Amino acid sequence: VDLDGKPIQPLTICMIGAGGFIGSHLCEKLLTETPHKVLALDVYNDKIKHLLEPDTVEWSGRIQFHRINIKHDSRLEGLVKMADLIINLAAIATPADYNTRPLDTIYSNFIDALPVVKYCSENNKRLIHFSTCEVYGKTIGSFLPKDHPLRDDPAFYVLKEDISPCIFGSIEKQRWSYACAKQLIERLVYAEGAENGLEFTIVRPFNWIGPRMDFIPGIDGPSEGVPRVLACFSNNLLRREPLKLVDGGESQRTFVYINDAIEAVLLMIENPERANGHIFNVGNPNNEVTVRQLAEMMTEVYAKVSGEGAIESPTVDVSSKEFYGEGYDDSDKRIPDMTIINRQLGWNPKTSLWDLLESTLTYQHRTYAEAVKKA
Amino acid sequence: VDLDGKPIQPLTICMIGAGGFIGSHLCEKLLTETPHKVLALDVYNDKIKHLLERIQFHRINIKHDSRLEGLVKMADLIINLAAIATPADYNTRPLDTIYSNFIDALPVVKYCSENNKRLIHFSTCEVYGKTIGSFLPKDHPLRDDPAFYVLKEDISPCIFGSIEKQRWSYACAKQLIERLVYAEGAENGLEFTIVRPFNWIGPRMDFIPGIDGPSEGVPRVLACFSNNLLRREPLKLVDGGESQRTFVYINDAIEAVLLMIENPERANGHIFNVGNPNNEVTVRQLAEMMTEVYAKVSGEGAIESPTVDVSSKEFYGEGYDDSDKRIPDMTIINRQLGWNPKTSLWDLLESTLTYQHRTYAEAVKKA
Ligand SMILES: O=C(O)[C@H]1O[C@H](OP(=O)(O)OP(=O)(O)OC[C@H]2O[C@@H](n3ccc(=O)[nH]c3=O)[C@H](O)[C@@H]2O)[C@H](O)[C@@H](O)[C@@H]1O
Numbered sequence: 001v002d003l004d005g006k007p008i009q010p011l012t013i014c015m016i017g018a019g020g021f022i023g024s025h026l027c028e029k030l031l032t033e034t035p036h037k038v039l040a041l042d043v044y045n046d047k048i049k050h051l052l053e054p055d056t057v058e059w060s061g062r063i064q065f066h067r068i069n070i071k072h073d074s075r076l077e078g079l080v081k082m083a084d085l086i087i088n089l090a091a092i093a094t095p096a097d098y099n100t101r102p103l104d105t106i107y108s109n110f111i112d113a114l115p116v117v118k119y120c121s122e123n124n125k126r127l128i129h130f131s132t133c134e135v136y137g138k139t140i141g142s143f144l145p146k147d148h149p150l151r152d153d154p155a156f157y158v159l160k161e162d163i164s165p166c167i168f169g170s171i172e173k174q175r176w177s178y179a180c181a182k183q184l185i186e187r188l189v190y191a192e193g194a195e196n197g198l199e200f201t202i203v204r205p206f207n208w209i210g211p212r213m214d215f216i217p218g219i220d221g222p223s224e225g226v227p228r229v230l231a232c233f234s235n236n237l238l239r240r241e242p243l244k245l246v247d248g249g250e251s252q253r254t255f256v257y258i259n260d261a262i263e264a265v266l267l268m269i270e271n272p273e274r275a276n277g278h279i280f281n282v283g284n285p286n287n288e289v290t291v292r293q294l295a296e297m298m299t300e301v302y303a304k305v306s307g308e309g310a311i312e313s314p315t316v317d318v319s320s321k322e323f324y325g326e327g328y329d330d331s332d333k334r335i336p337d338m339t340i341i342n343r344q345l346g347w348n349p350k351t352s353l354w355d356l357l358e359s360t361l362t363y364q365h366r367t368y369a370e371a372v373k374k375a
Numbered sequence: 376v377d378l379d380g381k382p383i384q385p386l387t388i389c390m391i392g393a394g395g396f397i398g399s400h401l402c403e404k405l406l407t408e409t410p411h412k413v414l415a416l417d418v419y420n421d422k423i424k425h426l427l428e429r430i431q432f433h434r435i436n437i438k439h440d441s442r443l444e445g446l447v448k449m450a451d452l453i454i455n456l457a458a459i460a461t462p463a464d465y466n467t468r469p470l471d472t473i474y475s476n477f478i479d480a481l482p483v484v485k486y487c488s489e490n491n492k493r494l495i496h497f498s499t500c501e502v503y504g505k506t507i508g509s510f511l512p513k514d515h516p517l518r519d520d521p522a523f524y525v526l527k528e529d530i531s532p533c534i535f536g537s538i539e540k541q542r543w544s545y546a547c548a549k550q551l552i553e554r555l556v557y558a559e560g561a562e563n564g565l566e567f568t569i570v571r572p573f574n575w576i577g578p579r580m581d582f583i584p585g586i587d588g589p590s591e592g593v594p595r596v597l598a599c600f601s602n603n604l605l606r607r608e609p610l611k612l613v614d615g616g617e618s619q620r621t622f623v624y625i626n627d628a629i630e631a632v633l634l635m636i637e638n639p640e641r642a643n644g645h646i647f648n649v650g651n652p653n654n655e656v657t658v659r660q661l662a663e664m665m666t667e668v669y670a671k672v673s674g675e676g677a678i679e680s681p682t683v684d685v686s687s688k689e690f691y692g693e694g695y696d697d698s699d700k701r702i703p704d705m706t707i708i709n710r711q712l713g714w715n716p717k718t719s720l721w722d723l724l725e726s727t728l729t730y731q732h733r734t735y736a737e738a739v740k741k742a
């Protein structure tokens with residue numbers, strides 16, 4: 001039964017990038033908590049093998065992998081035509097190669113999505129596009145003098161979806177390649193919703209954290225790979241190295257437990273009366289920390305989870321030239337405004353930062369420790 | 376002879392959107408002041424008809440025309456002006472705007488990089504969008520620090536409205552194309568230069584509605600106010616015309632572009648603000664100043680109230696938002712090409728409105 005009060009008609013859902021971090025967890029909540037049928041499209045299925053017929057036949061029927069690459073594969077339009085609802089996760093989304101493979105980044109996050117949008121509008125299918133909190137980029141507050149009082153006015157850091165600006169660095173700062181592409185795709189989807197009648201919903205994850213995020217370098221992922229902080233630190237703690245802090249890890253972020261976030265997405269799927277039209281911050285404003293804090297807190301939790309204790313210095317500073325490369329720039333403070341999502345879907349994040357790290361690092365320890373020993 | 380000191384080897388130049396406002400004036404400076412050969416590509420040639428009986432029109436639409444890649448290969452240097460650039464239909468045809476300013480340019484960029492041709496892409500000062508200063512409280516002292524309103528090309532941010540503010544459709548597309556061109560210059564070896572016009576003003580800009588274009592069309596402020604003065608109506612000021620802009624005489628600007636063409640040792644790599652920081656006014660001021668000049672130029676005098684306020688809902692439509700203050704920086708351009716705008720605002724309006732009066736007045740009477 002939906003929020004409006006109506007009963008929930010089941011759906012065939014075309015999920016693109018469904019073998020990803022967010023994809024995989026979504027498949028789980030859909031299978032376990034709902035009637036819906038999933039078409040899982042991705043180039044890899046590693047993270048959903050545990051749910052495919054070969055590894056199990058408990059969900060034979062209601063999920064179907066299709067190894068497709070949407071860059072060029074005729075098969076796609078038909079697969080879309082096959083479903084009632086398309087969810088597009090398929091994207092390069094590691095900051096690491098926004099300034100290093102800027103063309104592939106732009107093509108990934110803008111160009112390769114356009115077809116998906118063509119087909120949804122043509123065939124009158126509903127679209128859920130996954131954008132990012134990086135679309136807001138920098139916080140107006142960030143340009144005020146150090147410790148200027150205006151920084152304390154929420155006016156200057158809260159990121160409201162209907163009115164806060166999209167602020168990026170100059171062109172030479174190639175990290176914004178990703179954000180600018182995401183901005184344009186949102187603008188296009190919104191328009192297509194306006195010029196044409198596209199039913200759509202756009203999701204801006206603020207730093208979703210849980211298992212399967214990215215990869216541990218050398219194990220599941222590569223050796224010279226560079227993921228996103230959770231994965232990065234995770235590796236540091238497992239390998240018993242210190243945690244590399246980029247320019248002293250003074251940026252801030254707000255982390256939300258992946259489970260909390262998936263509930264949000266579900267509410268959107270099942271209440272199109274209230275999600276069609278809108279853009280949604282999915283984040284947990286209460287779990288804010290600096291990156292240095294995330295690191296400290298993660299070492300503490302990890303010691304709890306591991307048994308094994310501290311490290312001499314558990315962190316170290318490193319220049320962004322050294323770490324990220326040439327044209328790095330950074331989002332300074334993500335704090336989601338929860339008026340729109342709260343009003344439309346009644347959503348709120350239940351889970352604490354400490355709690356979600358206890359959860360996530362136990363998954364990390366139980367998965368990667370016998371492995372990282374044999375290496 | 377170039378700035379570096381070298382002599383200038385002549386060039387075949389592929390100019391796309393060459394029958395446009397900027398296109399047309401460029402063809403003139405190339406023909407009259409230089410050795411270069413021009414390939415003029417456009418769907419329309421109306422504004423180059425006068426100089427058409429070293430220049431070769433090709434009625435080509437770049438959206439889909441095989442002919443293009445060969446035309447590009449035909450030249451040494453490509454200049455891409457071809458773009459929807461009227462604020463009017465950024466919030467009203469957002470798809471066509473985005474496709475125009477991002478997607479349709481991509482092929483041009485494919486061919487230039489593939490075939491090792493030099494590219495000059497015309498972007499815009501909108502790419503900066505809003506000034507950081509715009510978010511400080513009314514009359515907050517920090518607004519006076521140039522830190523908060525000058526738009527430096529290598530470091531100032533691109534600040535746009537939320538998504539629902541569809542005017543930024545245009546700016547975001549232009550931003551991404553710049554980012555891609557710059558990326559292609561980095562990942563691949565593309566020789567390129569990007570131009571950010573700040574409000575270039577002069578002769579064949581846009582159209583007069585009902586004479587040079589659609590009766591219900593809506594161009595840029597020069598053309599809009601030009602029509603108001605010619606038709607003897609008041610000048611419609613959008614939300615009291617309190618935004619500011621800096622206008623540069625079209626002739627001054629074209630000199631800049633030429634310097635870039637003829638001095639690749641200094642222009643390859645860079646992004647350039649072409650504007651004239653000294654000619655800043657609010658829109659209300661531009662209107663006042665234009666009515667004054669026009670009275671001078673026309674003979675005919677004032678109007679009772681010569682302006683009137685109008686809501687942007689009423690004027691521009693649904694998702695309008697606005698660049699608040701353009702004031703270009705010039706350190707880069709000035710350092711690379713030695714360029715500076717000679718011409719005054721009043722002077723350039725005396726010039727432009729005399730062209731307007733001599734062109735549109737017998738016409739507007741007969742209507
Ligand atoms: O998960 C998200 O919601 C967002 O995460 C990333 O953006 P970001 O958070 O800036 O980048 P991360 O690499 O996760 O790290 C956060 C910040 O911590 C720092 N960091 C990261 C990694 C590390 O090992 N050390 C470190 O100090 C950097 O400032 C980095 O920008 C993606 O760019 C967005 O697409 C995505 O929506």
Ligand SMILES: O=C(O)[C@H]1O[C@H](OP(=O)(O)OP(=O)(O)OC[C@H]2O[C@@H](n3ccc(=O)[nH]c3=O)[C@H](O)[C@@H]2O)[C@H](O)[C@@H](O)[C@@H]1O
Nearest residue numbers: 460462499572573574575595596599611612613616618658
């Ligand atoms: O000339 C430029 O360099 C830029 O001009 C336009 O941007 P913009 O200046 O915002 O818009 P205009 O319609 O030219 O008018 C400027 C402002 O004057 C006001 N206006 C305009 C017209 C009118 O009749 N009345 C009026 O009050 C509005 O604030 C309007 O945005 C384009 O957005 C840019 O592509 C271009 O590079």
